[PDB]
Design a protein around this ligand. Structure first.
Ligand code: MG
Ligand code: MG
Ligand code: MG
Ligand code: MG
Ligand code: MG
Ligand code: MG
Ligand code: MG
Ligand code: MG
Lengths: 386, 386, 386, 386
């Protein structure tokens, strides 16, 4: 029943199944996992590959000797299992030096350090074959209004990303960047808080074609926003380079539940969109197995991520293939939404008396949209009840 | 005490002080106001000008004769008082024909009608001297996932705004457009839900220089977002063409309280930013006097809008002029935030061993940011308690 | 497929399918429905009965003659269809006189009027056979802090409900009261904002056994609360006299979507609880068919309310009957949660060295709770994918 | 300027100024503080006393020898400074054994352990002179619906608190309990999520007079609720035994900002209420100095807590003493809210034709409430601008 293959392109971060369960009010409930064991266990479950922060793979403060040993053992597990590494990223948030940010820290020497730590890990990412480099600026922000002049901060943020674009262009690397937005936590407010703010920032970079977004289900839902809508806007702009899948129950702390938990109907509309638009990138899970769980529960939670995606894929495909649904879509005029408003042009529209002077407003107004029957067909399909 | 003059450029919509108090659960508690009387009373209070939707000024379905009579009486009140009309907009949300939207309605004939109704009011706006034309797409959106393909909807939205840009370019009008975002209400989710999503959409229009944003305090706060931060991003992009001021107590229905109500410290940081950046446009209030109030209370609420802005302006100016505050800003390194990270360039940064190999991370980490003393000086100034 | 019968005890308010679609930003999109036609159409769909506010049935300001005529025609439709009237309530929110409340209005003459309007409709409710009388104090509250001394307001609220209890005791009526909480809208904050605040208030009334709660799915979700949890607390206290079913997508304006829309997994856990606890009252829908819809869509939306309840009932019953689920419940120690902590008593617990001095904390800590496998079995059952 | 004395009864938890800055995404930024030094530094700032969790004072797993040494050194610092210990509480949330709760853990042996750990610390609290014992059940709850049967959990919660009441009655201790509600974090949903749910639960305990609430500003605001309103309901019920003061910016993770930060007008209305009702208990701060700060900033943040309370006390007292404000309160009929609705009794009200048959609804409806002028006087007073 609903078994994943490496062809489904499911990926997990080392830090996901590796989360030891330390939260703001409690100590860890699980021992540390060796990244080599996580690679093996994930390959057994049907995953396609893994992702990493620099500091997940190479402990902070490691000598070039220990660094080389850690990478070599990782490489061997990849060769042994067939697992890929499609994305990597930088930890610019755990160590105390980043307490006021990395790229937008008020201290200039910290910003320079942040850039050098990033560039070193871009080299490693290319070596391991990654196509996408993600940046989540979790410490870029403020708890108080006077601590951060946001215009100056956006200048420094642009400067950082422009320098990174110069670096990969100089080296001839085939890698693209993806900015991951989040509205708050751990800072009181985070810069570039939603998909839209990130898309707008990208258009001010020197080489905008090198940058896209890495949206996360739970993050947009922490602002009360419709995640499938934001993903549609990112696809419309040609900027969905990567995506993070998980679950969230509303406006509260970042829960990082397994995918399919949280807002189930939103998860259905998301899969419908991703499959219908032909998104071809990794289906990456950024989730945390609850700290109530032991290691058997960690792997059950990971498996459930993939299972829920495949069940929703099946139901969304049945929905769109149903002749009764295609009829209802025409009844609600989704076909007319796809047709241009005025391909005749501005002058024709102005001269068209049926568009205003002779337009029957009351006849158009009384036409029902038939959206509630359409949505109940969608419910019936989701629940396997047609 | 804190008396406004027309030099402060305070403006109000006719629909604000004119709101009769009808809400989803109750009938109106006040009689209709003649726009001529609203103009006189606002001029007496020290306002600079007024704004309007087409349907606030000319009742829907009016003959060209009645239209001319309504405009002439309005013009006369403006000439009598010295009041200006800096902005106008279109009602694409009240009449039943717009129940699924105007520019993104699924029905093509409704979209054409929406465009013609808008163009007619652009002509009137130019005649009355408006510099800015606002578009709030309050019905553009959905309550259910299958009712609206958002990529097709964004195509239709771009098509509409592009045609409007062709129209004003054709006519030689000196007017710019400002898109007003809102996350929800009256639709379950509204397209372009925040300042960031609107800024990103503008960069895909054919003539992006003609378009900017008209953010509203309460709207960004309905998504839990930091309004001064979003305004800083809009200023950084050169896109703050207009602004709507009001108050909101958190994530809930759109309250439209008078300015200064709701989140008072956010209102302080907003005024600080607007004055420090030299924003030169109208300070426009989109608010609703609570339906508990009679007409004496309507004018008290309007007066309070302007009063609160002027008190906050005074306190923000005292904050920034205080030598002890300028010292604390240097203590928190706001001066270093304004200096480039790497004006030496990429190669210099890579060769700079003090940026990584010889960087003392523990010494930098132990440096306090001193942000809590800075924020208490800001509190003391806001409260008049230094 | 999943057809309701009057035995399922589904009920609808006249004001639900009767909503004409007027919202704060738009005029009505549907004509008024005659309550006689709503009764017939609902009986055809399989409903059990209907509910009403006084002003839904008898237009405000009606003579005793017109009142009698309106009731007689309603009675006849009930006799013709077999439909029952299990609950009634009072409109203390639409007319302008209630703009600062009914029972807690600052004006004493309005409070007296509110009580007399209520008592007149209690008599009618008894005549029509209602068992439950609901009070939703939608105008009891404030937009500003100084307008309402909440201690005095709670005194007036208690006084009102105590007088109502004296009235029904005097008359010998077999009717109970149910208070309906809501956190906000249309007032900025509403008194008794959640199920918990209402339960606590009831314990200070003179005759607490006459009063219970009428919680609404969407209302508790406007505070971000877990609705099944609140319903469990109300059942634990013996106070769930009635319930309002609908859907809501998070913290925002009151959406009143059809039941099953909004938070689908919460709807599943709610049905599981109601059926497992043997709740025997009406399954009442307080919803609004979206104003995008014509009358065919109104009835499709009503039908979908009942359909979704019956599908979820079936899946929750399959979940609890599954031997693999009963095994997993024992694996997560739900059986031990049901056993007393210390039926041996306080002295035995203090003398029990295995409870502290010889308790192995690290062995207990390492035991996994197995909650993620249990929740995936619940997901599989909900989606019909075992 | 605004200097606190021990007469102001300001108290702080050891865990507040002692927070090392570890958050879910970052390591600690400050070294551990010796509780002896925290006592001295707080006494220097003008605090009245301190509070503690068992595990803040005596490291978990300490021998009776080390326990005695830790208490003796604490006692000496108290004797040296004059500081009091008015409240204590139990850590039932940090150690992994409490990962599914303490009093409502599914495992029975963990629940017994939780009760024994609590009882041992009640004895210590009495020895140190505490009058109030707080219980915050931060782990009592769930992330998934099937993990916790809430009726059984409330049975176990009642059983635990009843046993604790039997214990203190047996020992003859003069101490009362205060339950602290929180809606979520660190569990996905927490049992007894608001002040109202806690007040309702207390009325089902065997000896309800021994129990009250300990509400926290930020916690009620994480549900979007009006904190002064909830505090008024707790005062009305006679159950405000203790209070936790801090700041929060809306619906998001628990920020624990210093008091006066976050919602400033809510802080003003809270102080107005506490002073006007004659609340006589400790003004306790449960806050976290941001991890951006060094130790100088920790003490600046603590000082600011007390400063902001004293400034707001002064402004609220000026507001209520202002003759123009007392006039406006009569204009909005706050005097009539305080007078009984029907001291004449039920029969008199029914016979009073001026209450219904001859009541002029339109005359009452047109009366303005004058609430916007009242609220602007409150704003003017808060800002020191009359
Ligand atoms: Mg996350
Ligand atoms: Mg992520
Ligand atoms: Mg608004
Ligand atoms: Mg606006
Ligand atoms: Mg509702
Ligand atoms: Mg209801
Ligand atoms: Mg807290
Ligand atoms: Mg606390």
């Amino acid at each position: 029943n609903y078994q994943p293959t490496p062809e489904d392109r499911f990926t997990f971060g080392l830090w996901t199944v590796g989360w030891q369960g330390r939260d703001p009010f409690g100590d860890a409930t699980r021992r540390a996992l060796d990244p080599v064991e996580s690679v093996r266990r994930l390959a057994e479950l049907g995953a396609h590959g893994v992702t990493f922060h620099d500091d997940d793979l190479i402990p902070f403060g490691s000598s070039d000797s220990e660094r080389e040993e850690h990478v070599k053992r990782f490489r061997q597990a990849l060769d042994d299992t067939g697992m890929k590494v499609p994305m990597a990223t930088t930890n610019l948030f755990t160590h105390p030096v980043f307490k006021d940010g990395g790229f937008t820290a008020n201290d200039r020497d910290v910003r320079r350090y942040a850039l050098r730590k990033t560039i070193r890990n871009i080299d490693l990412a290319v070596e391991l074959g990654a196509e996408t480099y993600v940046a989540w600026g979790g410490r870029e922000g403020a708890e108080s209004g006077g601590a951060k002049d946001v215009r100056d901060a956006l200048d420094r943020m642009k400067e950082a990303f422009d320098l990174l674009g110069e670096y990969v262009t100089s080296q001839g690397y085939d890698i693209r960047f993806a900015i991951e937005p989040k509205p708050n936590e751990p800072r009181g407010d985070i810069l570039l808080p939603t998909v839209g703010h990130a898309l707008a920032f990208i258009e001010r970079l020197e080489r905008p074609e090198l940058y896209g977004v890495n949206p996360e289900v739970g993050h947009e839902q922490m602002a009360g926003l419709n995640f499938p809508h934001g993903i549609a806007q990112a696809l419309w702009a040609g900027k969905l380079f990567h995506i993070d899948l998980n679950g969230q129950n509303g406006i509260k702390y970042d829960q990082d539940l397994r995918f399919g938990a949280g807002d189930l109907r939103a998860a259905f509309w998301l899969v419908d969109l991703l499959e219908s638009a032909g998104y071809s990138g990794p289906r990456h899970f950024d989730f945390k197995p609850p700290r109530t769980e032991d290691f058997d529960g960690v792997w059950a939670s990971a498996a459930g991520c993939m299972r829920n995606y495949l069940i929703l894929k099946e139901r969304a495909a049945a929905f769109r293939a149903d002749p009764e649904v295609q009829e209802a879509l025409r009844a609600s005029r989704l076909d007319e939404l796809a047709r241009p408003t005025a391909a005749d042009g501005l002058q024709a529209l102005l001269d068209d008396r049926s568009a205003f002077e002779e337009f029957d407003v009351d006849a158009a107004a009384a036409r029902g949209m038939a959206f509630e029957r359409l949505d109940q067909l969608a419910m019936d399909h989701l629940l396997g009840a047609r």
